[PDB]
Amino acid sequence: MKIEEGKLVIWINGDKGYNGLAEVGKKFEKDTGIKVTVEHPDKLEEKFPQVAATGDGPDIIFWAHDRFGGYAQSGLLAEITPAAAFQDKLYPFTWDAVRYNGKLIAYPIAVEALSLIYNKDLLPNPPKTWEEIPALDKELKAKGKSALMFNLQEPYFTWPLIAADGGYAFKYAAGKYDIKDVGVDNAGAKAGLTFLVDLIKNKHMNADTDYSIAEAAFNKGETAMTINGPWAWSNIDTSAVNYGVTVLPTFKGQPSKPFVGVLSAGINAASPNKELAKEFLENYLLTDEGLEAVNKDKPLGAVALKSYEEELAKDPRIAATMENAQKGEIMPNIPQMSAFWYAVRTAVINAASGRQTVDAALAAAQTNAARRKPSWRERENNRRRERRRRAVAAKIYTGLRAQGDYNLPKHCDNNEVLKALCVEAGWVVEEDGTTYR
Amino acid sequence: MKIEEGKLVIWINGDKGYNGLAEVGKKFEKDTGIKVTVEHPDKLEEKFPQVAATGDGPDIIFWAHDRFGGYAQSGLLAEITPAAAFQDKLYPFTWDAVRYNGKLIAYPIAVEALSLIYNKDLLPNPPKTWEEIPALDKELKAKGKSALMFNLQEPYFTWPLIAADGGYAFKYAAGKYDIKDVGVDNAGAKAGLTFLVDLIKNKHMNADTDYSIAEAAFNKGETAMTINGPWAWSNIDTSAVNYGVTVLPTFKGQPSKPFVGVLSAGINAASPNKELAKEFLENYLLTDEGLEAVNKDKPLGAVALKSYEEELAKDPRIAATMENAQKGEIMPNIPQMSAFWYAVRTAVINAASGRQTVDAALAAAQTNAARRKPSWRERENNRRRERRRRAVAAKIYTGLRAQGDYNLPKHCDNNEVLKALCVEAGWVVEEDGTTYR
DNA sequence: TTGTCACGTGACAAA
DNA sequence: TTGTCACGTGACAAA
Ligand SMILES: OC[C@H]1O[C@H](O[C@H]2[C@H](O)[C@@H](O)[C@@H](O)O[C@@H]2CO)[C@H](O)[C@@H](O)[C@@H]1O
Ligand SMILES: OC[C@H]1O[C@H](O[C@H]2[C@H](O)[C@@H](O)[C@@H](O)O[C@@H]2CO)[C@H](O)[C@@H](O)[C@@H]1O
């Protein structure tokens, strides 16, 4: 698709309150006549960098802040320049999450952190440690149910356990993240992953479990516990499960450390509606009424707007979310975050499945998470080099065929031309290419 | 995932009533103690052939009958052996849809055909032809609405228009489909796709429109018409739209001809639960109570079970579905169907976006749809030949380097060795490889 | 059908 | 960093 003047198109993930956001777009359309379309395409965080490099893509893209640094580095986002009065309306730390190279690259919307979600009727007192989950599963499997089910296909869900005993993504020292210092293969990381793999090995969890499978099992009452964000609450509400939201379990006595995301809205640098997009985000979405409309669809978490977070913070589920977020860390927004996520995703799936040992999967993840992506010019240099190597050889064999007058078959390959040249120069070449004088 | 003895895992597309099917599973578990898990993974029709070739995948897979011929050719499905008494409970033509090389390869469930769905409040009198839609759109645009929106990313939804004036997939002759006689590039197909592309050029439809975009627009009352199947009805029921289901519009005075699919259930040849699978399908799903539970979730269309179809056929929406189905054709189940669908999908998306002209897109689609997929042995033949060609050349240059005494630099490529050979044999080689005596 | 050479990126290594 | 050769499939042709 392509941006065009007078209309706004928004991309937001399918697990957020896109219908609520569409209502805000409707009030925006009535007040100034600009149509707003909200769409929730799949793999939007991957599609955007592909289409925006050529000027395509939506007017506004919603995602957690961790992806936006890469978009900025690639020149895909318009610089955000809110007035002092508006900046004052959001918590300063949410602005930090969307600052890259000293510039604001998106509007922060809400703070997301994973929590432990449990079925009060099935589990009145949830466990406080990861280590007691296996025994709890034995007891619950006797009654037909299971202890815990969560998304094992996305490392965002498994990261809190991996990070608990010492795993880290990029080390932060002296005011910066060190891109070549990766903590995915240390003792803490290995221990956390090993415990997860052992749960699968001991049949307390299934390796192929994904978001829908886990959500269904918990919402239908088949599993005592799940790990998810604030967005998931709405479906649990409509179900018949009585749920609580609490702190994630400890592992080896240390807290689970979730990677904290700030749902953010960036403006396509290619959009001709940048002023309209600011007006929508600043004066319609980032307001009490606008955030409420979205939050009523699927909870946003701890919103960045001070005025409305004071209402939401009363919710004990948001309080547990922020308890988990205090034990966690705000994600970096550096461009290498995407390579880190792919690396850890492959490590978790490969170890959970048995295709690799935990040691082998995390060793590869460390290499992949620090690997430097070659530049376009480096790729073109390689391409051109091979083009040149083949052209030189082809000219040589063209000359040999035309002027050699070798005793060659009607149709033969260049290897047979090489052989005829070898014999003419005093060599004997055997059938397999063994060559000598 | 691998299937375990004593439990059933089912795969079914996410637009079908998987929750209703899960209720049927809970009854199977209640009466036999065998757990049944229903999952709806993305791209399941593509994942199944990849994982099932090695014994992985579900016990049962649901999809339209057109993919099952390919699965059966690759040995992925267990042969279906219903007693004659059971076969008599289903309409004969639905058994034909799942017969491949004389054998039954799946249980037929329901007959699906696309229909025109319209908003009666915005559009009391639906249009009878495609040709009048552009004018209808102009009128509705003055009211802040649009005429028609439907999924342009899947060729299933555009095929009824392409086939209307004479487009066909594979010609049927002498009791068989001719896999080399493809009709995606004839005058009828061109006329149909040109009309669709012209709708986009005159701003009556958007090229990026997909399933979710079209469903939301119709179910929120923003567009007067959509094209979809019976599965979509239940979401329209809960919405505020008062809708009708009617015959698809004519094009050039000829009826739109949808490709008719038979939702079918195949049994993984790797399952050790083939008898449990057969018991579940025959005695629990393909029953009045069984299909009712799935139909209440998301309508199946015209079910293959005569006893329950007598009830469902009373519904005017099913009558419209079968009116469209009579004007269409049952899809072939031959293995080439997947290559046909991929080709037409590319043709539609490339023409709708302007990346290719209608004639260029459909010319390419005809070639790709008729192309013979090289066998594994043909690919292996090619791989080994080039491996051998490189190995012979490597041995020649190994011997030249070791016994040549060519006065070469410390590091050089094989082209430089070849040049030394040439000069030794009485040739002169320029820098670009120009070689003469 | 088999067969030649092109193609751009991967595995590896010297520096 | 630059640089070699491998790698399997594509474009094209003889038959
Ligand atoms: O799993 C890797 C993934 O983690 C985060 O994605 C979260 C996202 O922040 C949440 O809003 C929610 O949608 O769940 C996602 C995980 O499925 C990162 O933001 C993302 O970049 C990363 O790929
Ligand atoms: O678009 C190509 C696609 O068409 C059919 O898929 C249908 C399916 O039969 C319906 O049940 C429903 O889910 O819509 C699908 C299209 O999105 C063919 O059955 C399928 O093989 C083909 O790829």
Measured between CA atoms, how close is A315 to chain B, in angstroms? 30
Q: CB–CB of B339/B180 below 8 Å?
A: no
Tell me the CA distances in angstroms from B288 to B6, B65, B276, one per residue in order: 26, 22, 19
Query: Strand pairing of A243-246 and A115-119?
Result: antiparallel
Query: Strand pairing of A103-104 and A99-100?
Result: antiparallel
Read out DSSP for B274-305? HHHHHHHIIIIISSHHHHHHHHHHS--SEESB
Which nucleotide is nearest, taking the CA of residue B395 and each C1'? Answer: D5
- Structure tokens, B379: 């690919």
Tell me the CA distances in angstroms from B301 to A370, B65, B111, B308, B356, one per residue in order: 53, 15, 6, 11, 36
User: What domains are defined for chain A?
Assistant: 7-112+260-330 (3.40.190.10), 115-257+336-370 (3.40.190.10), 378-436 (no CATH)
Integer distance in angstroms from CA A38 to C1' C1?
Answer: 54
| Phi and psi, residue B181, nearest 5° | -110, 85
Tell me the CA distances in angstroms from B256 to A138, A247, A293, B362, one per residue in order: 58, 58, 42, 19
Classified as helix, coil or strand, B78 is coil
Q: CB–CB of A33/A303 below 8 Å?
A: no
Q: In angstroms, rounded to a whole number, what is the distance separating the alpha carbons of residues B286 and B90?
A: 9
Residues of B in contact with A422 (CB under 8 A): 396, 400, 421
The CB density around residue A214, as the number of other CB atoms within 10 Å, is 25
| Nearest by Cα to A303 from A364, A258, B261, A289 | A289
| Nearest by Cα to A63 from A41, A93, A90, A82 | A41
Q: In angstroms, rounded to a whole number, what is the distance separating the alpha carbons of residues A116 and A114?
A: 7
Classified as helix, coil or strand, A425 is coil
Kindly state whether A389 is in contact with chain B, defined as any CB-CB distance less than 8 angstroms.
yes
Q: In angstroms, rounded to a whole number, what is the distance separating the alpha carbons of residues B292 and A150?
A: 31
- Please tell me chain A's helix, strand, coil percentages from 3-state DSSP, rounded to the nearest 5: 50, 20, 35
| Nearest by Cα to B38 from B51, B24, B48 | B24
Residue minimizing CA distance to atom 6 of ligand 1: A156
The CB density around residue B85, as the number of other CB atoms within 10 Å, is 7
Q: CB–CB of B129/B254 below 8 Å?
A: no
| Nearest by Cα to A109 from A266, A320, A259 | A266
Q: In angstroms, rounded to a whole number, what is the distance separating the alpha carbons of residues A361 and A346?
A: 8
- Structure tokens, A301: 């978490």
| Nearest by Cα to B250 from B151, B133, B113, B341 | B133
Asked if A415 lies within 8 A of B433 by C-beta distance, the reply is no
Read out DSSP for A118-137? EETTT-SS--SBGGGHHHHH
Which nucleotide is nearest, taking the CA of residue A380 and each C1'? Answer: C8
Tell me the CA distances in angstroms from A225 to A151, A348, A421, B115, one per residue in order: 12, 20, 74, 43
Q: CB–CB of B114/B324 below 8 Å?
A: yes
User: ∠ CA(B135), CA(B139), CA(B143), 5° rounding?
Assistant: 155
Residue A154 near ligand 1, beta carbon < 6 Å = yes
CA of A156 to the centre of ligand 1 (A): 6
Integer distance in angstroms from CA B91 to C1' D10?
Answer: 47
Classified as helix, coil or strand, A49 is helix
Read out DSSP for B354-371? TSS-HHHHHHHHHHHHH-
Kindly state whether B210 is in contact with chain A, defined as any CB-CB distance less than 8 angstroms.
yes
Residue minimizing CA distance to atom 15 of ligand 2: B156
Report if CB B389 to strand D is under 7 Å: no
Q: Give helix B358-370 / helix B187-201 axis angle, nearest 10°.
A: 130
| Nearest by Cα to A112 from A306, A341, A330, A335 | A330
Kindly state whether B393 is in contact with chain A, defined as any CB-CB distance less than 8 angstroms.
yes
User: ∠ CA(B22), CA(A199), CA(A338), 5° rounding?
Assistant: 85
CA of A381 to the centre of ligand 2 (A): 44
Kindly state whether A238 is in contact with chain B, defined as any CB-CB distance less than 8 angstroms.
no
Query: Strand pairing of B259-267 and B435-436?
Result: unpaired
Query: DSSP letter at A406?
Result: -
Instruction: Report CA torsion sign: B282, B284, B287, B290.
Output: negative
Nucleotides in chain C with any atom closer than 7 Å to protein CB:
2-10, 14-15
Integer distance in angstroms from CA A380 to C1' C10?
Answer: 15
Query: DSSP letter at A65?
Result: G
Please tell me the experimental approach by which this structure was elucidated: X-ray
Q: In angstroms, rounded to a whole number, what is the distance separating the alpha carbons of residues B271 and B77?
A: 9
CA of A262 to the centre of ligand 1 (A): 10
Read out DSSP for A318-334? HHHHHHHHHHSEEPP-S
Q: Which residues line ligand 2 (CB under 6 A)?
A: B 13, 15, 45, 64, 66-67, 112, 154-156, 261, 341
Q: In angstroms, rounded to a whole number, what is the distance separating the alpha carbons of residues B266 and B104?
A: 10
**Identity of residue A263:** L
Best probe of the A interface among B13, B353, B432, B435, by most A CBs < 10 A, is: B435
Q: CB–CB of B327/B257 below 8 Å?
A: yes
Candidates B213, B403, B433; nearest CB to A437: B403
Q: In angstroms, rounded to a whole number, what is the distance separating the alpha carbons of residues B392 and B379?
A: 20
Measured between CA atoms, how close is B324 to chain A, in angstroms? 30
- Structure tokens, A323: 């308890």
- Structure tokens, B83: 């007693």
Classified as helix, coil or strand, A39 is strand
Q: In angstroms, rounded to a whole number, what is the distance separating the alpha carbons of residues B42 and B355?
A: 27
Q: CB–CB of A25/A34 below 8 Å?
A: no
**The dihedral formed by the CA atoms of B55, B60, B63 and B68, expressed in degrees to the nearest 10:** 50
Asked if A418 lies within 8 A of B422 by C-beta distance, the reply is no
Residue A346 near ligand 1, beta carbon < 6 Å = no
Kindly state whether B40 is in contact with chain A, defined as any CB-CB distance less than 8 angstroms.
yes
| Phi and psi, residue B225, nearest 5° | -145, 155
**The dihedral formed by the CA atoms of B92, B95, B96 and B100, expressed in degrees to the nearest 10:** -160
Q: In angstroms, rounded to a whole number, what is the distance separating the alpha carbons of residues B177 and B182?
A: 10
| Nearest by Cα to B290 from B24, B97, B92 | B24
Q: In angstroms, rounded to a whole number, what is the distance separating the alpha carbons of residues A322 and A317?
A: 9
Query: DSSP letter at A112?
Result: E
**Identity of residue B291:** L
Q: Which residues contact B364 (CB under 8 A, 6 or more apart)?
A: B343, B346, B347, B356
Asked if B40 lies within 8 A of A392 by C-beta distance, the reply is no
Report if CB B397 to strand D is under 7 Å: yes
Q: Which residues contact B20 (CB under 8 A, 6 or more apart)?
A: B293, B294, B295, B296, B297, B298
Scanning B309-328 for CB atoms below 8 A from A yields: none
